[PDB]
Amino acid sequence: STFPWLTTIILFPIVAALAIPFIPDPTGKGRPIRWYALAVGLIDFALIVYAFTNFYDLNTPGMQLWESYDWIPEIGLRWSVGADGLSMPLILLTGFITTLAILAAWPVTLKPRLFYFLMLAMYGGQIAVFAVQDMLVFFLAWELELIPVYLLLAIWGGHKRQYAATKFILYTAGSSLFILVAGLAMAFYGDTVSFDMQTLAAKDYALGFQLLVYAGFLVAYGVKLPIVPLHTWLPDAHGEATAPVHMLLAGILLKMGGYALIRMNVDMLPAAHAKFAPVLVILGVVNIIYAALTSYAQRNLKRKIAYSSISHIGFVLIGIASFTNLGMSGAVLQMVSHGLIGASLFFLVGATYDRTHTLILEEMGGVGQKMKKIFAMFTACSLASLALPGMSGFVAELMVFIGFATSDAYSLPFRVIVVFLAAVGVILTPIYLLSMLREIFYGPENKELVEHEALVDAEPREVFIIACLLVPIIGIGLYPKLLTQIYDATTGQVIARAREVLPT
Amino acid sequence: EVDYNVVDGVVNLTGFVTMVTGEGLKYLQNGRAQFYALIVLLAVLGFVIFSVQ
Amino acid sequence: ATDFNRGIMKFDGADSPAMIAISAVLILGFIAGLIWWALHTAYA
Amino acid sequence: DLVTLAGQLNAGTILPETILIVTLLVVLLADLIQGRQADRWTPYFAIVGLGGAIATMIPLWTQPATISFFGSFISDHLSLFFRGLIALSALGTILMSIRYVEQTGSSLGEFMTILLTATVGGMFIAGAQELVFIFVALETLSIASYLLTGYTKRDSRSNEAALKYLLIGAASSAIFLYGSSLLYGLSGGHTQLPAIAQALSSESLGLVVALVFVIAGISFKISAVPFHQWTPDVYEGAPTPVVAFLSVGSKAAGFALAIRFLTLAFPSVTDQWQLIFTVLAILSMILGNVVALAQTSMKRMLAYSSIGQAGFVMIGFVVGTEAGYASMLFYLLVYLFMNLGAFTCVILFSLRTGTDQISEYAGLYQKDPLLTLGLSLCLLSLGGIPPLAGFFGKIYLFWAGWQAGAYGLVLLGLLTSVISIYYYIRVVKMMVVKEPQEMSEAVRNYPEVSWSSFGLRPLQVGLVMTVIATSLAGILANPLFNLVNTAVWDVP
Amino acid sequence: VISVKPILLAMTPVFILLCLFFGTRNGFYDTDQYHGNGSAH
Ligand SMILES: CCCCCCCCCCCCCCCC(=O)OC[C@H](CO[C@@H]1O[C@H](CS(=O)(=O)O)[C@@H](O)[C@H](O)[C@H]1O)OC(=O)CCCCCCCCCCCCCCC
Numbered sequence A: 001s002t003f004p005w006l007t008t009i010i011l012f013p014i015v016a017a018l019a020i021p022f023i024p025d026p027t028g029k030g031r032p033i034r035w036y037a038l039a040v041g042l043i044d045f046a047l048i049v050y051a052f053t054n055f056y057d058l059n060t061p062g063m064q065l066w067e068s069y070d071w072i073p074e075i076g077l078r079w080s081v082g083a084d085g086l087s088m089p090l091i092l093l094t095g096f097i098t099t100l101a102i103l104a105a106w107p108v109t110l111k112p113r114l115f116y117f118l119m120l121a122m123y124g125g126q127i128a129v130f131a132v133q134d135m136l137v138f139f140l141a142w143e144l145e146l147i148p149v150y151l152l153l154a155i156w157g158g159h160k161r162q163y164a165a166t167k168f169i170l171y172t173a174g175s176s177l178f179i180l181v182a183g184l185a186m187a188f189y190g191d192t193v194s195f196d197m198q199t200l201a202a203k204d205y206a207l208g209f210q211l212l213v214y215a216g217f218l219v220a221y222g223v224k225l226p227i228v229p230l231h232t233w234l235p236d237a238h239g240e241a242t243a244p245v246h247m248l249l250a251g252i253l254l255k256m257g258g259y260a261l262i263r264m265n266v267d268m269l270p271a272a273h274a275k276f277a278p279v280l281v282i283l284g285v286v287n288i289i290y291a292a293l294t295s296y297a298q299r300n301l302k303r304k305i306a307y308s309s310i311s312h313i314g315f316v317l318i319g320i321a322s323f324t325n326l327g328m329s330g331a332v333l334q335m336v337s338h339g340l341i342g343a344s345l346f347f348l349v350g351a352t353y354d355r356t357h358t359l360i361l362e363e364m365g366g367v368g369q370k371m372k373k374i375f376a377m378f379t380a381c382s383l384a385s386l387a388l389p390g391m392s393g394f395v396a397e398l399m400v401f402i403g404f405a406t407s408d409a410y411s412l413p414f415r416v417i418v419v420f421l422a423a424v425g426v427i428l429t430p431i432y433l434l435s436m437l438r439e440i441f442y443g444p445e446n447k448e449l450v451e452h453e454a455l456v457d458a459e460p461r462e463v464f465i466i467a468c469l470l471v472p473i474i475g476i477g478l479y480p481k482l483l484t485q486i487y488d489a490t491t492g493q494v495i496a497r498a499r500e501v502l503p504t
Numbered sequence B: 001e002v003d004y005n006v007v008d009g010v011v012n013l014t015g016f017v018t019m020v021t022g023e024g025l026k027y028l029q030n031g032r033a034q035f036y037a038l039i040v041l042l043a044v045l046g047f048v049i050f051s052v053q
Numbered sequence C: 001a002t003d004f005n006r007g008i009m010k011f012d013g014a015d016s017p018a019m020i021a022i023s024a025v026l027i028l029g030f031i032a033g034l035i036w037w038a039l040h041t042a043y044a
Numbered sequence D: 001d002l003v004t005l006a007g008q009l010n011a012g013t014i015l016p017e018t019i020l021i022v023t024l025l026v027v028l029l030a031d032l033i034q035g036r037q038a039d040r041w042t043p044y045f046a047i048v049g050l051g052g053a054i055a056t057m058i059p060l061w062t063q064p065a066t067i068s069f070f071g072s073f074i075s076d077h078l079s080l081f082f083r084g085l086i087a088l089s090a091l092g093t094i095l096m097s098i099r100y101v102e103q104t105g106s107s108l109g110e111f112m113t114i115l116l117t118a119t120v121g122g123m124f125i126a127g128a129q130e131l132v133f134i135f136v137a138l139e140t141l142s143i144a145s146y147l148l149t150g151y152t153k154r155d156s157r158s159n160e161a162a163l164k165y166l167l168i169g170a171a172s173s174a175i176f177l178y179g180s181s182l183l184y185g186l187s188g189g190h191t192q193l194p195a196i197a198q199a200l201s202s203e204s205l206g207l208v209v210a211l212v213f214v215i216a217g218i219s220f221k222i223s224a225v226p227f228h229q230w231t232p233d234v235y236e237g238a239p240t241p242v243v244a245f246l247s248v249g250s251k252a253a254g255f256a257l258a259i260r261f262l263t264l265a266f267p268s269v270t271d272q273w274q275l276i277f278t279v280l281a282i283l284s285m286i287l288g289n290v291v292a293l294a295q296t297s298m299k300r301m302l303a304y305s306s307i308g309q310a311g312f313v314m315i316g317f318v319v320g321t322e323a324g325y326a327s328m329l330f331y332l333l334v335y336l337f338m339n340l341g342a343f344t345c346v347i348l349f350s351l352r353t354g355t356d357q358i359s360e361y362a363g364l365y366q367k368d369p370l371l372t373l374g375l376s377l378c379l380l381s382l383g384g385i386p387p388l389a390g391f392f393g394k395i396y397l398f399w400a401g402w403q404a405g406a407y408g409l410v411l412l413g414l415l416t417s418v419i420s421i422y423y424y425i426r427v428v429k430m431m432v433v434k435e436p437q438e439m440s441e442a443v444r445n446y447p448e449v450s451w452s453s454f455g456l457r458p459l460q461v462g463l464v465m466t467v468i469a470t471s472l473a474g475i476l477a478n479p480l481f482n483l484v485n486t487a488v489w490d491v492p
Numbered sequence E: 001v002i003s004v005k006p007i008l009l010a011m012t013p014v015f016i017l018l019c020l021f022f023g024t025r026n027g028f029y030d031t032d033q034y035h036g037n038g039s040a041h
């Protein structure tokens, strides 16, 4: 218990990435590089599992692993790490998703050195975001992921990727513009200039100042998390990409903006959270409605699944402002289920893109007459994505609906209107995913699609990744009490504080 | 069509007015030498004009 | 524009400004009215 | 000699400047006696002399602050830090100029004499309490920057830019000299600034007129917004090590002169020029980071980036807290290494290829990985990537600006940085993103991937040292903040 | 109540062991089977 674990887990890919430019002579395509990176990711996930199964307890509602390191006697940059209740499954999802994305990146030929170096650099930042417990080092870790994913989407993507990459880096800079201001504003109020996280939650502010701080938080969190006025970056970001970077794009990177959206805007200030809770609920409803109606008319194969990320994060945007213990506990499960569904679905889309070069739903008419494992895996992943109860998406939306049904201060009109609108939202959301599977596979055999390109049936390696990605969703949806006890005390303390602050 | 035109054109319009603002502000450097000293003397006079009033 | 109407979504008015302008202002008007109604209705 | 006159003269805080003068004399005598065949030990001897001048300041650091030459020179930790900054600029200028001058065609010793003269003038102007001493050192630096521009020997761009720079500098020097004579005439006749600032608490309009007429010639040297009309024409036609010295050494000299002169002269009218400095920074950052988006030349892009980044230092000079000048002292120390690496990579790319257009930058990932690696690792530090030291400087700058009470300045600085990252990332987009069969001509026939001809190894190891320094200053800056903060509390 | 640690510590070593065993399994990216460098472009 006296040994630093999370610091070495963060620093180990950053140290191990220096051996990627070394590389004694393979005389080939770069197979020792991926064979070293897969072993590094495997032992990092093993260290994460060994650190989770021993020292993390389920009794103390605070932070089990508390390690503080004085970096400088200056401003207040302090390496203080801490694992919470609703952040502990996030690191185990991060390591698992990044390990399977490293394992899924076999056909890399054009510059694999910089690819695996940026992969090992992003894997350090994806743990350094969730493991930090500061205000300035959190902004540093938020701006740490600015360059590598933008560089990967620049050096490879679909067509006209240069217009999308500059828009993505300028959108991320506009997101990071407000974080330093909103972090210094709450820190410069009164006294205790040091940037400890436990002291910033005990401070008292005025009403209009808290409204301005919550507005500066919500602007950046609406730029990051896609809502209907600020989601124009996401088709250009998540449509023009390849599979192993799209796994990390559609997995933990979207939940990073939702974890801080809970942790800051509920624990730091809940007084201004209740005044923007109907606005956030209505924005999530309009997000859920607009994503399906936009993705149904789209003809691109990848944007049709990229808008499902908006359609699934609208449920989190609804369940955040429910003011209920079950509604707060279901949001983390919905985020984990959406990440595990979207990473598998986008890896499958990037896998079937190599077998059929045209990304049009009209010419794809007879791709199911030769390969059957691909069609079976697509049907299984789609049925896991729509509404199925064996997977945990139905359990998560049921938790959201039950937590929103028994609420307060929204008695007669608001609950029934939001429930009736989310019901037609879940009417609308399987339509495009059904129409895509009806148009691509179900049909006659196209002669020109076989004459132009030749498709080969899938490997047993491609079965293994989907078999590893599908079983935790079924394990959570069959028994939802495994994820409940991890953050039950933390969500109970959060809802108790939010109901103590909220009057009447 | 609304999502492709209306909410998408605002960012492109801000980028376009930023680009033409940069163009119209780099058009000022003509290359005349004594016009630069005239601008310098105008700034020197305008500093006292703004600081007195 | 050109790569948006190739399947079963082909119509006559798709890129005309006079239809998409009134459709966009109707959508934004209902969005603003719903936000204003949910703000003035809840917590009461 | 007499011990009493030598004790009353106090000539002990002048030794590195006399070592540099002796080094200049030995270099000039070796150029006069031997000639052109002795161009292999003279810059190494000058580097040894600069190191011996920068190493003897350690006994001068642990010394009490005393005045010298009867209240003419003041020796503090700030003046020693500025002298070390100017010496580290000059040594990197020598390391980048050793191959460039002999590739140009002129003799190296005649350039190194004027370079050491400008270094001695910068070391003298890093103190500069006395008014006539300020004028003599400023005109010495001005004549040095005049004579270092026309070095290309009848190439049209440098001699066409040098006349415009001479006109603008002579106008600014006449304005500053009229303001200096006005400031001499406003007092009773004293020249020492503690003796001038005691009898200037009357709030006259002539004090404001003299302040504007002095700050015009000051802000010409700082090159803020109302006197930035020389640099986009100067920085393109001048040779690249000359402008590499002038982008950092003259700027730090102007900053030190502004800080020391305004502190020792006007501790009464600070709120009158605080609003002026906010207006200058607000206009300068906007004009630089909006104009620099449309330029297609790389050297003009770095020229306008210098104006866009010179306005961030003014935010630390607007405030009156003790942590404001520490931000400027840290940002200049980071910007020295950043501009040194960004100039060394441009010097290497212009010496190995020729012209240095932006669209020619495609196809650098396969020919020389070290050059594009150093250029990317330096431009990302110039942009503000949090593993690098420029972000660590900008966070302290914005923290001081939000602590003292300047919200709009920090907001405009963040907005201009977000705007400026689009053209800061453009050279990396041209370098590491462009595929094969896409690059322009004169890239496909790179003959000299190895360096073994006439001292290219110091030019390579200087870029390696700059890359290692800007990579290790970001995550390890614990003694640097203490060394900055121990030299800022002496300023009242 | 069902815990997560004894069901995770018994499922992670076979997960570590199967990764390399399925990494040596290939056959689609072997002879030619494709015309491209691996990315989309
Ligand atoms: C509400 C909070 C909002 C927070 C975010 C905003 C914070 C402030 C941002 C600062 C503004 C940046 C100005 C500089 C922009 C620029 O240089 O563009 C240059 C590029 C190049 O354009 C393209 O460039 C291509 C060539 S290339 O890529 O550059 O090589 C070319 O092919 C193509 O034609 C051309 O289009 O333009 C773009 O990529 C478009 C993205 C520009 C990003 C601007 C962000 C401002 C958003 C406003 C808020 C929107 C609100 C929506 C809801 C109403």
Ligand SMILES: CCCCCCCCCCCCCCCC(=O)OC[C@H](CO[C@@H]1O[C@H](CS(=O)(=O)O)[C@@H](O)[C@H](O)[C@H]1O)OC(=O)CCCCCCCCCCCCCCC
Residues within 6 Å of the ligand: A372, A373, A375, A376, A377, A379, A380, A383, A390, A391, A474
């Ligand atoms: C908890 C709820 C869980 C819900 C799970 C939902 C799964 C939905 C899967 C839907 C797949 C649709 C594929 C349709 C058939 C096809 O075209 O491919 C046919 C190919 C066969 O290949 C080929 O098939 C050919 C036969 S033919 O082409 O189909 O005629 C044959 O000729 C050839 O040799 C052979 O290579 O695929 C297979 O049949 C593999 C089996 C997939 C069927 C899954 C069975 C579902 C079991 C449920 C287990 C519940 C788990 C509970 C956990 C506690």
Ligand SMILES: CCCCCCCCCCCCCCCC(=O)OC[C@H](COP(=O)(O)OC[C@@H](O)CO)OC(=O)CCCCCCCCCCCCCCC
Residues within 6 Å of the ligand: A014, A020, A021, A110, A111, A112, A113, A114, A117, A121, A147, A148, A151, D365, D366, D369, D370, D372, D373, D376, D377, D387, D388, D432, D471
């Ligand atoms: C903490 C890291 C955060 C991410 C920052 C990284 C930004 C990306 C790097 C810039 C692009 C560099 C291209 C250089 C070009 C280069 O020199 O190598 C070029 C070299 C060429 O290899 P390839 O086999 O790709 O060559 C092309 C061939 O395929 C021929 O077609 O590629 C590599 O080996 C990449 C090595 C990584 C090189 C980057 C290392 C950066 C180390 C420092 C990282 C920061 C440390 C911060 C402090 C901790």
Ligand SMILES: CCCCCCCCCCCCCCCC(=O)OC[C@H](COP(=O)(O)OC[C@@H](O)CO)OC(=O)CCCCCCCCCCCCCCC
Residues within 6 Å of the ligand: D001, D006, D007, D008, D009, D010, D011, D012, D014, D015, D017, D018, D021, D022, D025
């Ligand atoms: C043509 C070549 C020209 C090269 C320059 C000539 C250098 C010759 C003399 C060295 C100057 C430094 C002497 C300090 C070296 C030293 O410390 O000496 C010791 C003594 C100073 O001692 P202090 O009184 O500081 O005592 C220190 C002790 O108390 C500590 O133990 O200096 C002298 O005796 C002064 C008289 C030297 C003669 C006058 C020299 C001063 C005028 C020189 C011109 C100055 C301006 C030069 C820059 C423009």
Ligand SMILES: CCCCCCCCCCCCCCCC(=O)OC[C@H](COP(=O)(O)OC[C@@H](O)CO)OC(=O)CCCCCCCCCCCCCCC
Residues within 6 Å of the ligand: D022, D023, D040, D041, D044, D045, D047, D048, D049, D050, D051, D052, D054, D055
């Ligand atoms: C705070 C950081 C400060 C760091 C500064 C660095 C200080 C150390 C730098 C030393 C590296 C320089 C030598 C390496 C250079 C080196 O190793 O390469 C050897 C160098 C190059 O020779 P080549 O190989 O070109 O020789 C000609 C060939 O063609 C034949 O092989 O030749 C020299 O000997 C140059 C003369 C050096 C003369 C040294 C100075 C003589 C003593 C002067 C005493 C001065 C008293 C003070 C002034 C009054």
Ligand SMILES: CCCCCCCCCCCCCCCC(=O)OC[C@H](COP(=O)(O)OC[C@@H](O)CO)OC(=O)CCCCCCCCCCCCCCC
Residues within 6 Å of the ligand: D452, D457, D461, D464, D465, D468
């Ligand atoms: C003395 C007080 C000041 C010291 C400050 C240090 C300045 C930096 C070092 C420069 C000294 C000179 C080096 C010249 C080098 C020299 O003259 O060449 C030595 C040699 C190159 O020449 P060779 O002897 O191979 O060539 C023989 C020839 O005849 C073949 O053509 O080694 C190189 O490959 C150097 C590679 C650059 C390596 C640069 C490393 C710099 C040290 C970095 C330490 C990093 C620590 C990182 C921690 C993470």
Ligand SMILES: CCCCCCCCCCCCCCCC(=O)OC[C@H](COP(=O)(O)OC[C@@H](O)CO)OC(=O)CCCCCCCCCCCCCCC
Residues within 6 Å of the ligand: A467, A471, A478, A479, E002, E005, E006, E007, E008, E009, E010, E011
């Ligand atoms: C109609 C509805 C039907 C629903 C039925 C579904 C039941 C699902 C419930 C699951 C929760 C189980 C908790 C019981 C488990 C339990 O109570 O015992 C847990 C028990 C722990 O043993 P002890 O407590 O003795 O261990 C103490 C030590 O672990 C201390 O270090 O052993 C296990 O770890 C079993 C190994 C995991 C076995 C996993 C089985 C599934 C493996 C599947 C592998 C994938 C197959 C892929 C095929 C391609």
Ligand SMILES: CC1=C(/C=C/C(C)=C/C=C/C(C)=C/C=C/C=C(C)/C=C/C=C(C)/C=C/C2=C(C)CCCC2(C)C)C(C)(C)CCC1
Residues within 6 Å of the ligand: A089, A092, A093, A096, A336, A376, A377, A380, A466, A467, A470, A471, A472, A474, A475, A476, A482
């Ligand atoms: C790591 C992780 C995790 C995990 C945990 C757990 C809990 C696990 C598991 C669990 C469990 C306890 C589960 C199991 C059971 C079940 C099963 C076993 C199932 C089955 C299935 C199968 C095997 C099938 C297959 C298929 C089909 C159905 C058809 C088509 C094809 C395929 C292949 C897809 C968590 C959550 C923390 C989160 C994060 C991450």
Ligand SMILES: CC1=C(C/C=C(\C)CCC[C@H](C)CCC[C@H](C)CCCC(C)C)C(=O)c2ccccc2C1=O
Residues within 6 Å of the ligand: D088, D091, D092, D451, D452, D453, D454, D455, D456, D457, D458, D461, D462, D463, D465, D466
């Ligand atoms: C002159 C010469 C040398 C001698 C040069 C050696 C001694 C290297 C000189 C490097 C100097 C000493 C670096 C100085 C280091 C500074 C302290 C760095 C500080 C500045 C940074 C901020 C950049 C060679 O070693 C050589 C090797 C192979 C072919 C030709 C030659 C060759 O022509």
